[PDB]
Every structure is written in structure tokens, then in C-alpha cells.
């Protein structure tokens, strides 16, 4: 339920989203 | 070379320059705004290599009406590169293409 605001990539954990987001 | 590469990898080839085409009227590359304000200068190419698709296609906020998008990232570096666009009506031409973000590619466009 967690969507990257930059790319639209969807994640099932908030922690996954945080790591991915900060790679942008 | 002939090629556009993943910027992070530097030498992972994503597409070749002959694959660039004008889907829009503004040209092969234009700036688009995503639903959170982020600007992506998106280059349309018929074909891209070395990308992993994430999830399933979606029409929400599609910059190209009649096409749905699927997130695409480098198979080597997992960097975000762009999106695969797939037609939702059988008459769209083409039926698929890729939008690659300028900031993710080398050489620097
Ligand atoms: O055609 C496209 C490609 C996808 C792009 N996009 C995003 O970057 C994004 C981020 C978060 C939620 C939703 C989206 C979305 O649709 C966008 O806005 N339009
Ligand atoms: Zn992202
Ligand atoms: Zn890469």
C-alpha cells in the first residue's frame, strides 16, 4: 500500500518505500 | 555509441537511438508532471532492453491517453529508468513503447 511519490513504484512495507525513495 | 545507457551503471545499454520516435506532438522528449509535482523529461522509444517491470499496467495519470504505464528499473542497478506504456485500445499505434527519463540516461541529453 505504499507508493513512491517520484516513480509510482508500489511497495507492501513503509520501510521498503523509504529505502527506495531515498535512492532517487 | 549507438546506445543510451543507464546513468548509474554507465555502460548498461537501455535503448538505441533509432528507437526514439515522436508519439506526442511536442516531439520525442517533453517534460511531464506526475501527480506529486515531480517533473520527468520523458523520451519515447519503441523498445528498451535490460529493464525489470514492476507490477501491472495502470492508466491513472497517464501522460499518453490510451496507454497504461508500468514502472521500469535497471535490471543491473535497480535504478528507476522510466515506464513501459501499453495500449488499452487495439487501434493505438504503436501498441507499446517506453518512456525513459532524461535524468536516468547517458550520454547526457
Ligand atoms: O504516464 C505516467 C507515468 C506514471 C507517472 N506517475 C508517477 O510518477 C507516479 C507517482 C506516484 C503515483 C502515481 C504516479 C504516476 O502515475 C505519471 O504521472 N504518468
Ligand atoms: Zn521511486
Ligand atoms: Zn543501471
Distance of CA B81 from the midpoint of ligand 3 (Å):
8
Ligand 1-lining residues (CB < 6 angstroms): A 3, 5, 7-8; B 34-36, 60-63, 69, 83
Q: What is the DSSP string of B62-94?
A: -SSTTEEEEEEEETTT--EEEEEEEESSTT-SS
- Residue from B97, B84, B5, B81 nearest B40 by CA: B81
Q: What is the DSSP string of A1-24?
A: -EE-TTT--EESSHHHHHHHHTT-
Numbered residues of the known binding site of B for (S)-thalidomide: 61, 63, 69
Pocket test for ligand 1, best of B23, B29, B33, B35 (most atoms within 8 A of CB): B35
The reply to whether residue A5 touches residue B79, judged by beta carbons under 8 angstroms, is: no
Sheet (strand B29-33) strand order: B29-33, B39-45, B96-101, B80-87, B67-74, B51-58
Distance of CA B83 from the midpoint of ligand 3 (Å):
15
Expressed in Å, this structure's resolution amounts to: 1.9
As a whole number of angstroms, the distance between CA B79 and CA B47 comes to 18
Amino acid at each position: 500500500s505504499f507508493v513512491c511519490s517520484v516513480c509510482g513504484h508500489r511497495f507492501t512495507t513503509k520501510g521498503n518505500l523509504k529505502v527506495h525513495f531515498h535512492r532517487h | 555509441c549507438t546506445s543510451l545507457c543507464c546513468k548509474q551503471c554507465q555502460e548498461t545499454e537501455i535503448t538505441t537511438k533509432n528507437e526514439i520516435f515522436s508519439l506526442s506532438l511536442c516531439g520525442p522528449m517533453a517534460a511531464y508532471v506526475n501527480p506529486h509535482g515531480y517533473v520527468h523529461e520523458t523520451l519515447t522509444v519503441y523498445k528498451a532492453s535490460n529493464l525489470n517491470l514492476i507490477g501491472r499496467p495502470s492508466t491513472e495519470h497517464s501522460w499518453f491517453p490510451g496507454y497504461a504505464w508500468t514502472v521500469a528499473q535497471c535490471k543491473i542497478c535497480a535504478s528507476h529508468i522510466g515506464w513501459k506504456f501499453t495500449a488499452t485500445k487495439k487501434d493505438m499505434s504503436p501498441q507499446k513503447f517506453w518512456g525513459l527519463t532524461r535524468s536516468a540516461l547517458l550520454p547526457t541529453i
